[PDB]
Design a protein around this ligand. Structure first.
Ligand SMILES: Nc1ncnc2c1ncn2[C@@H]1O[C@H](COP(=O)(O)OP(=O)(O)NP(=O)(O)O)[C@@H](O)[C@H]1O
Ligand SMILES: Nc1ncnc2c1ncn2[C@@H]1O[C@H](COP(=O)(O)OP(=O)(O)NP(=O)(O)O)[C@@H](O)[C@H]1O
Ligand SMILES: CCCCCCCCCO[C@@H]1O[C@H](CO)[C@@H](O)[C@H](O)[C@H]1O
Ligand SMILES: CCCCCCCCCO[C@@H]1O[C@H](CO)[C@@H](O)[C@H](O)[C@H]1O
Ligand SMILES: [Mg+2]
Ligand SMILES: [Mg+2]
Lengths: 576, 571
């Protein structure tokens, strides 16, 4: 069942030009195997015409024979060059379509599955998959029809000249070969997959070390960093050597079998020529067939290995990239209300198992009101807002948005209704314009510049900020606070009902913090605001404060009513 | 270049490489006898065909078989040695890269992402592979087969054949070298765009959650699709030139070798040339394609994998200023900091530090504050040796920073960065980053001082597996990992750049208390917007638009300075 899905996926990557290039590759490979299967006859015809006669034969017929053999050899080589020209053209063609499908497939994945592996890994995963497709495209377009044509014609013709021992041992070889190899193909595929996986692990550890180089540099940790890579490389070499040995043995055993079987057919026809039983023309034809048969035998060996091993390694890739999906019912045409209220009823959550992060959170929040959420680091403030923000769907209990449950809300609509300002910043290595256009694609040059003022990012160091400012990897081109302001400027282009600010202002100074937080409430008057903070001034300003402790909501109401009642907020209000 | 490739080969690597060269050379000697054995077989066919002529035909046919078998055994043996050599050279190549990346400056490291550096290793590994191959296979072997051909065809006194044969190798080597550089440039430019494309994929995948939550599929997809279009166009440009060279080389061969075939046909028809010689000539025309092909590769592949490997060495071994350093420096337990008229720019376009003049001392805690963009991080980064292109001077008890080795500076100063850098590994590994030789107890002791020894009423294991960017942990728990590292280290200066922002007052004060206790003589610079640290410091420094605008005690500043007055009013 998964076998059919695989080839349909490869076929789909080919546009009209892609389908032509693929069929041209199949045709030219097939045509040349027909032509080259003729050539050992031509050689035999040349041999007899000369053998015996003492220069007494048609010199014009020898020239015609020699020219036909040349046409065979030329057309077979033109075919090789034409196939590789078509192959690269098809690689180029299928490449773009393959890569975008991956990016779009990665966008539709869940946050839990995305977080599982880094960029180093996903980047080299595309690499392995692309190459896997390439191999499969080749093995199909080249090693299916062509070796069958050359093997059929060879047994048919040798059978026609009534040589039973030759055609017999020839057919015996293809039989022993196809059996022996298939009885060892899976054993290679498994050893190759296991290797390729360790290779991903190794690219993953390189990108992990390079992304955290500054940390390792400043801790003078070259030895610790170098040794954990050197260990990964050692796991890679050992996995590669294990494949190499099996691969090397199969090749040597297949070579020794060929020498024993085809060697006998060569000795048999030698004795046949020495005892006048067999003609020289025929001897040359059997000798010519033994030599010609190696390439179709090679193309079969390849197919039996390469098709099974690239199908296994490609199966594993499609699995860890299209599998993880619970249900998600969603609503067909939903047009969310400008005013939305939040109702969390007996919400429970665990990231893994054995440990519960949210015990039985029961809350009720309303339009145009600001709420503060606090608690110790590990209580689950981020977790709770992430679930509200649809990061996770494996939760016990229910969450409503004006009667409508989250479970029945499409990820697109939820993201239009709620805007989560994350604890960590996510700045794209691109222009400032690009980072803000992330919030709204259709936004004009003015709408974007207006938003810079609202986030206090219109002027940096007495200089006006350009929308064309190039932003380095992780936006480390900008200060901690300037990073927070990019993410804040995004909110102003968006139009949400709920606004979550998870410690999203921590890097800003008192002036900026207050001015932006002011501008938020001004620009979004009816917006429900959840604010996560460990700071009294941010807790004070709220219409109501919620204290989360070890998963459960332990305290509610006004900050003043809590600053003495509650154990945690009294701990905060220890200073001054 | 070739010395760098040679160095990647250990003793087993050098054997495998020479075995590859030998076997390729030996097989070209053997296969160059082949057209003469075919001639003798054609000669015997037009003879008497006596018992001895039949026996000689068989012994001849056996020698041709030995040629064909030994040539194929050589191909299989070469590919077995090649993969063994690839495996061998692989590890050594990869570590040299990681170690080369560690020795690079922060400014140059920040220039490109992991997606880029990962695929950069890929391209160079493959460029080495190609070079190892074209050298071990396409140098001696085609020369042997081309020499013996002209020698033997010259011996049989066929001038037109050996003439046009030598003419072809001459026109070929000229025509191709004329277009090799044009191919290498088109290939390099393509491979570079390919890096750009892998860079944009890792950039998008690292910030997927942002793009997902902003429903930005179209903007994200469009950007990548543009990069892929820049990739296809760069690839198509190489493809066309590559395809033309191949078709023109093929058409030249058909015209030149086709004439040698027609000439010897007419020679056979007019009794001038024997059939035995006519076969030997076509047998040489057919045999010559593989050495012509290997020269076609050698010419084109050696140049294009040298161009793209030149680039890789340039961007991974250059951009070093000076660094005089110090031979054997043993830094004093007590160190004072003296910044004199410090000025700095990142891209020279704008000044970040105007003329910072400061003086700090042992065992005292100092607070640094100012608006976001003043340059607090910049200043401590320069103190921590992130950047060396600065005007003014920085001393450490008479010794200038310029004369301090990056290893010694990192042992004297410990910078707790604004953003956290958690390794995807065990908690043990993340803490061993600070001190390799640390025992299981030294590490757990440090977990208590970091307030990380217990998470959710459960004792924290040193074997806790930490996901990409440590997102397996809470904002504050991340900060605590970086804080726990400091307790294994032994510095004179301790910089805390907003490194406790994700912590509540209790823990912030509690960890900062255990820092001062465990490091009594340590000079502490604290960057904070909050007041629970500014009030605790021995002196406060206010940075505004590059210049230090206010100094002294916090209480004396919330009277004098409006910024410090307004900040304290947040009570
Ligand atoms: N992806 C994850 N996988 C497993 N456990 C996690 C993950 N993220 C967080 N946790 C744990 O879940 C608990 C609460 O997580 P989180 O919601 O980030 O907390 P928080 O209470 O908001 N803390 P903070 O923001 O630092 O002050 C902590 O004990 C974390 O260790
Ligand atoms: N790597 C960089 N490349 C270019 N400019 C930079 C870089 N890092 C910082 N800057 C700029 O230098 C100035 C000061 O940066 P930084 O030292 O991080 O500031 P900060 O004043 O400490 N702000 P913060 O800690 O966010 O509240 C700002 O104008 C930044 O945009
Ligand atoms: C035009 C009349 C017939 C020509 C004589 C028959 C021999 C055909 C040429 O054989 C070639 O010999 C080479 C070594 O000499 C091999 O490397 C090559 O694989 C093989 O294809
Ligand atoms: C001309 C009379 C003397 C000929 C005696 C030697 C036998 C030549 C065998 O050559 C083989 O012929 C095949 C034909 O298809 C090619 O595929 C193959 O590469 C080549 O090796
Ligand atoms: Mg949190
Ligand atoms: Mg800073």
């Amino acid at each position: 069942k998964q076998k059919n899905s695989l080839f349909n996926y490869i076929y789909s990557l080919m546009d009209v030009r892609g389908k032509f290039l693929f069929f041209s590759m199949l045709f030219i490979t097939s045509l040349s195997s027909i032509i080259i299967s003729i050539s050992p006859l031509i050689l035999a015809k040349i041999t007899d015409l000369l053998s015996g006669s003492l220069s007494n034969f048609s010199y014009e017929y020898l020239v015609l024979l020699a020219c036909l053999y040349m046409f065979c050899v030329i057309s077979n080589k033109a075919s090789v060059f034409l196939f590789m020209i078509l192959q690269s053209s098809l690689r180029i063609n299928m490449q773009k379509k393959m890569s975008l499908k991956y990016l779009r497939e990665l966008y539709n994945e869940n946050i839990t599955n995305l977080s599982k592996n880094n960029a180093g890994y996903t980047t080299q995963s595309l690499n392995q998959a692309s190459n896997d497709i390439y191999i499969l495209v080749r093995n199909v377009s080249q090693n299916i029809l062509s070796p069958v044509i050359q093997l059929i014609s060879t047994i048919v013709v040798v059978l026609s000249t009534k040589d039973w021992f030759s055609a017999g041992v020839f057919f015996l070889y293809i039989l022993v070969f196809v059996i022996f190899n298939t009885r060892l193909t899976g054993s290679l595929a498994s050893l190759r997959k296991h290797s390729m996986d360790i290779t991903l692990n190794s690219y993953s550890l390189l990108s992990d070390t390079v992304d955290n180089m500054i940390a390792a540099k400043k801790n003078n940790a070259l030895r610790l960093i170098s040794e954990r890579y050197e260990d990964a490389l050692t796991q890679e070499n050992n996995a590669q050597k294990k494949y190499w040995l099996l691969s090397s043995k199969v090749l040597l055993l297949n070579s020794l079998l060929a020498v024993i079987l085809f060697g006998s057919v060569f000795i048999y026809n030698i004795l046949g020529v020495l005892n006048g039983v067999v003609s020289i023309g025929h001897f040359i034809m059997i000798t010519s067939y033994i030599i010609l048969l190696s390439t179709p035998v090679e193309n079969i060996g390849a197919l039996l290995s390469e098709i099974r091993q690239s199908m296994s390694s490609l199966a594993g890739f499609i699995q860890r990239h299209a599998e993880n999906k619970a249900t998600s019912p969603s609503i067909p045409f939903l047009n969310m209300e400008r005013k939305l209220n939040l109702s969390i009823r007996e919400l429970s959550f665990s990231y893994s198992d054995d440990k519960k992060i949210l015990n039985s959170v029961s809350l009720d929040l309303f339009t145009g009101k600001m709420y503060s959420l606090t608690g110790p680091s590990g209580s689950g403030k981020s977790t709770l807002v992430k679930i509200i923000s649809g990061y996770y769907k494996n939760y016990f209990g229910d969450i409503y948005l004006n009667d409508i449950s989250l479970r029945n809300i499409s990820d697109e609509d939820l993201n239009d209704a709620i805007y989560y300002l994350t604890q960590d910043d996510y700045i794209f290595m691109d222009t400032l314009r690009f980072n803000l256009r992330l919030a709204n694609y259709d936004a004009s040059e003015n709408e974007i510049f207006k938003v810079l003022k609202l986030a206090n990012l219109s002027v940096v160091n007495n200089e006006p900020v350009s929308l064309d400012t190039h932003l380095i990897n992780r936006g480390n081109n900008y200060s901690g606070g300037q990073k927070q302001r990019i993410s804040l400027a995004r909110l102003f282009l968006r139009k949400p009902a709920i606004i979550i600010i998870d410690e999203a202002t921590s890097a800003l100074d008192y002036i900026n913090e207050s001015e932006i937080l002011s501008s938020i409430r001004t620009h979004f008057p009816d917006a429900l605001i959840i604010n996560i903070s460990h700071r009294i001034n941010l807790l004070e300003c709220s219409d109501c404060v919620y204290v989360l402790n070890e998963g459960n909501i332990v305290a509610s109401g006004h900050f003043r009513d809590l600053m003495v009642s509650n154990e945690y907020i009294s701990g905060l209000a220890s200073v001054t």
